Amino acid sequence: MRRYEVNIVLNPNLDQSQLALEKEIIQRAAENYGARVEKVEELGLRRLAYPIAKDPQGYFLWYQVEMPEDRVNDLARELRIRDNVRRVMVVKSQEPF
């Protein structure tokens, strides 16, 4: 197991209902791939470095997870297939919470 930060950008135009659903899907996927979700932060709306799906902003979520290294790429791939997920970036945790 190793600790990673998962940075997720979502469609900025979601209702709180839809948003809550997307977070539930993310957590189930992480658990299905063996991750322990240690911390979740809702960062909120930011201007993207470049527009995605023609929208210049995105709703940001950040997770600190501990999970097997061999499954990290499969989880990122599973997350990127939801239509509301605009961007996923996973980095190794340097200064964990």
Curated annotation (Swiss-Prot):
**Keywords (A to Z) from UniProt:** Ribonucleoprotein, Ribosomal protein, RNA-binding, rRNA-binding
Task: Specify whether RNA-binding is a keyword of the entry.
Answer: yes
Recorded hits in SUPFAM superfamilies, A to Z, give: Ribosomal protein S6
Q: Name one GO molecular function term.
A: structural constituent of ribosome
Its domain of life reads Bacteria
A GO biological-process term? translation
Q: Which Pfam families match?
A: Ribosomal_S6 (PF01250)
Does the keyword Transmembrane feature in the UniProt annotation? Answer: no
One GO CC term, this protein: cytoplasm
Q: Assembly and interactions?
A: Part of the 30S ribosomal subunit. Forms a tight heterodimer with protein bS18.
Query: Belongs to which family?
Result: Belongs to the bacterial ribosomal protein bS6 family.
Give a short account of what the protein does: Located on the outer edge of the platform on the body of the 30S subunit.
HAMAP family xrefs: Ribosomal_bS6
Q: Which PANTHER family match?
A: MITOCHONDRIAL 28S RIBOSOMAL PROTEIN S6, SMALL RIBOSOMAL SUBUNIT PROTEIN BS6M
What is the protein name stated in its UniProt record? Small ribosomal subunit protein bS6
This protein's species is Thermus thermophilus
Tell me the classification of the organism that encodes this protein: Bacteria, Thermotogati, Deinococcota, Deinococci, Thermales
Q: Which gene encodes it?
A: rpsF
